[PDB]
Amino acid sequence: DARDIIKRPVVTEESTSILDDKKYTFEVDTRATKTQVKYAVEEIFDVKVAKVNVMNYKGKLKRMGRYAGYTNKRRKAIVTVTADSKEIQF
Amino acid sequence: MHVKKGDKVKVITGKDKGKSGKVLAAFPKKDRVLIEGINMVKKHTKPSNVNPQGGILNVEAPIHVSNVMLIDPKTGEPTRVGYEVKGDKKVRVAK
Amino acid sequence: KECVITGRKSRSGNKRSHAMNSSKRTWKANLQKVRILVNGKPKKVWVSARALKSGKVE
């Protein structure tokens, strides 16, 4: 269920700035684990993963007039690969 | 709806009474029909990604279905409609 | 708390006085905790003196 653990990449200026150091920012299932993410990325892209970082984000409050609600709860992994491996592209 | 896209149509009531036209669109969620040359109306359109010149545009608006009557493409005259089964295919019938 | 045989137990009524003042009280049963055979084996159970004066084996 690699394709279900790894939902999306996180395309932002921070992320792109960080890609040159062979680090990849993925958005992931909130129940995933660091180790699952490791083996899933290794599966899905045939890279070697050295280290995997992960943070959890609360949902931000937004409005559209009379109607408030929190954006979805996010979990952002930052995989990094062994230097002697092939890159994930974006 | 007793009137369908692609039909030829007469207008019963309204300011455009007596006129005729094709059915360019239908809205059964509202029981309205979009008919050529009927209920032409002037939209004051600021320029945007399309209509980037902008302007006052004459275009057709919808009018209700009950104000409208179908025309038999063989006679060319207006006909109230019934339904019959040809073989195993329901169809529309003039009367 | 109730007799295992005829399930008699605390019921409730009034305590009346001279002057017929009504107050509230309970009539408890004379339940004694003694052995009997509930089944082919024994057990130490609340049982009532009424039920005990003849017919049940300790």
């Binding site: 394709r3 790894i6 939902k7 999306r8 990449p9 996180v10 395309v11 899905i44 974006f90 | - | -």
Partner: protein, 59 residues
């Protein structure tokens, strides 16, 4: 779907895997801004649904 029922319980799961790969690539393209056709998402997702469904039906 009728075309889908002609498959013997493993080709069906292989197509499921393939559709999962395709869907991941589409979510990736979309997150990157590179996807022109957005309605292929629903189509692939519903194909997956049908395959899991007929698998269970045979089970």
């Amino acid at each position: 779907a009728n075309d889908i029922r002609d498959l013997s319980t493993t080709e069906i799961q292989d197509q499921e895997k393939a559709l999962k790969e395709e869907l991941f690539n589409l979510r990736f393209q979309l997150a990157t801004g590179q996807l022109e056709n957005t309605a292929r998402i629903r189509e692939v997702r519903k194909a997956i649904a049908r395959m899991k469904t007929i698998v269970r039906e045979r089970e």
